[PDB]
Amino acid sequence: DRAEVRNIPFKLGMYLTVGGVVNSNATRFSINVGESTDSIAMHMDHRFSYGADQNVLVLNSLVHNVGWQQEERSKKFPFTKGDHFQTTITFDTHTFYIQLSNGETVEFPNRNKDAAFNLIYLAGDARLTFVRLE
Amino acid sequence: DRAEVRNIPFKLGMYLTVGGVVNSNATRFSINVGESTDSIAMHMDHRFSYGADQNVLVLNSLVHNVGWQQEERSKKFPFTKGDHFQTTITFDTHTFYIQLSNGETVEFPNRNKDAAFNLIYLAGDARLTFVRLE
Numbered sequence: 540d541r542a543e544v545r546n547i548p549f550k551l552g553m554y555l556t557v558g559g560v561v562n563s564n565a566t567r568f569s570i571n572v573g574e575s576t577d578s579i580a581m582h583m584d585h586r587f588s589y590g591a592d593q594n595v596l597v598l599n600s601l602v603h604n605v606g607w608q609q610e611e612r613s614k615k616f617p618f619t620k621g622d623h624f625q626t627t628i629t630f631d632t633h634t635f636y637i638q639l640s641n642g643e644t645v646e647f648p649n650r651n652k653d654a655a656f657n658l659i660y661l662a663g664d665a666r667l668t669f670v671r672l673e
Numbered sequence: 674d675r676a677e678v679r680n681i682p683f684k685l686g687m688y689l690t691v692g693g694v695v696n697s698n699a700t701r702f703s704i705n706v707g708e709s710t711d712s713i714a715m716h717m718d719h720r721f722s723y724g725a726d727q728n729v730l731v732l733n734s735l736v737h738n739v740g741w742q743q744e745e746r747s748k749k750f751p752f753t754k755g756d757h758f759q760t761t762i763t764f765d766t767h768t769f770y771i772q773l774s775n776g777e778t779v780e781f782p783n784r785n786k787d788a789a790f791n792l793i794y795l796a797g798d799a800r801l802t803f804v805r806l807e
């Protein structure tokens with residue numbers, strides 16, 4: 540199915556580093572941190588070609604039985620199809636701090652002010668090769 | 674549910690370190706490396722009190738739609754209910770190499786000669802607090 544880390548709580552102060560490989564001919568893939576596949580506090584989508592979006596990062600949250608909220612977009616896109624990537628995420632109750640493969644960072648609001656998350660997963664056209672959550 | 678790391682391949686040469694806490698009044702808990710909850714190549718059960726077994730490690734494999742194979746048991750048991758533990762696992766095509774919190778080791782045959790595993794999970798009376806698989 541998708542690559543999942545489930546019920547190993549990602550809590551305030553811990554760091555999550557995932558590494559993987561983008562597929563050749565990838566459309567998009569995302570890293571999702573939340574509660575379930577329908578309850579995502581930080582959705583980070585990497586769009587190689589999706590609709591009108593080409594080489595952009597789109598960040599958003601998904602509320603259970605409600606839907607996607609306000610998107611934030613970033614133009615920082617050090618990603619290449621067929622290549623490796625590595626991303627580190629930490630958060631406090633106000634902000635998710637994300638660091639990309641090249642050291643550039645992107646910040647996204649912790650909109651629900653959650654202190655722990657029990658599901659981390661990747662979906663779309665990429666695969667994970669390692670994870671550290673500590 | 675249980676603590677799971679799914680579809681992030683654990684391959685020949687990589688190391689898996691999981692850390693957690695044993696519940697107070699724990700009966701037993703296990704760390705399972707395999708393909709599914711019905712297909713486990715290395716089952717490591719930690720028995721505080723289970724039947725006639727008290728403070729013993731039991732290792733075995735579970736074959737899909739067949740069942741448990743020959744058990745191997747170890748008397749090394751540096752575990753205390755309510756306390757933390759940390760375990761490191763690597764394997765080659767013949768052997769799973771397991772290192773316990775106190776540095777003692779236990780070895781178990783890789784009975785199917787598998788080179789990669791797509792499910793790592795914990796079940797029973799413990800919880801995981803961190804994982805590194807790299």
Ligand SMILES: OC[C@H]1O[C@@H](O[C@H]2[C@H](O)[C@@H](O)[C@H](O)O[C@@H]2CO)[C@H](O)[C@@H](O)[C@H]1O
Nearest residue numbers: 582584597598599600607608609610611
């Ligand atoms: O916001 C994350 C969310 O985006 C959806 O796509 C949006 C698209 O970004 C937007 O430009 C357009 O107006 O509406 C689309 C549908 O809501 C994705 O479908 C979804 O998977 C998430 O990635």
Ligand SMILES: OC[C@H]1O[C@@H](O[C@H]2[C@H](O)[C@@H](O)[C@H](O)O[C@@H]2CO)[C@H](O)[C@@H](O)[C@H]1O
Nearest residue numbers: 716718731732733734741742743744745
């Ligand atoms: O071997 C792992 C497997 O053990 C089962 O328990 C065994 C028990 O170890 C043995 O002494 C007894 O004779 O038979 C029991 C049932 O097969 C557990 O039930 C199972 O969960 C695994 O842990």
